[PDB]
Ligand binder design. Structure first.
Ligand SMILES: *[C@@H]1O[C@H](CO)[C@@H](O)[C@H](O)[C@H]1NC(C)=O
Lengths: 49, 49
């Protein structure tokens, strides 16, 4: 049970970092491209999601 | 038609004439001059308005 606590926070951090690498209805999961691959008028439309 | 291994100036292609129906979809049109492209295609044809 001691290693259980560290294992739990391990899954927690792993999921927290992992799920960023995922578009949410976005053309891409990585912001700086969307910023650099479109202009604000519709780049906002994606970054809001 | 495949285009490869060359330098593509956006400005000269953009300012050649006033293209009647000109729109770039997945990207803001301006910053092509800074971008790199892998295996661009050109689809040539003639259509009515
Ligand atoms: C031919 O190329 C020149 C050089 O940029 C351009 O000014 C002209 O518009 C081109 N003619 C076309 C695209 O019909």
């Amino acid at each position: 049970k001691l290693q259980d606590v560290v294992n739990q926070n391990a899954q927690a951090l792993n999921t927290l970092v992992k799920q960023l690498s995922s578009n949410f209805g976005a053309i891409s999961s990585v912001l700086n491209d969307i910023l650099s691959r479109l202009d604000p008028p519709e780049a906002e439309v994606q970054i809001d999601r | 038609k495949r285009i490869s291994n060359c330098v593509a100036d956006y400005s000269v292609l953009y300012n050649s004439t006033s293209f009647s129906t000109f729109k770039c979809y997945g990207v803001s049109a301006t910053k092509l001059n800074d971008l790199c492209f892998s295996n661009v295609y050109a689809d040539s044809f003639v259509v009515k308005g």
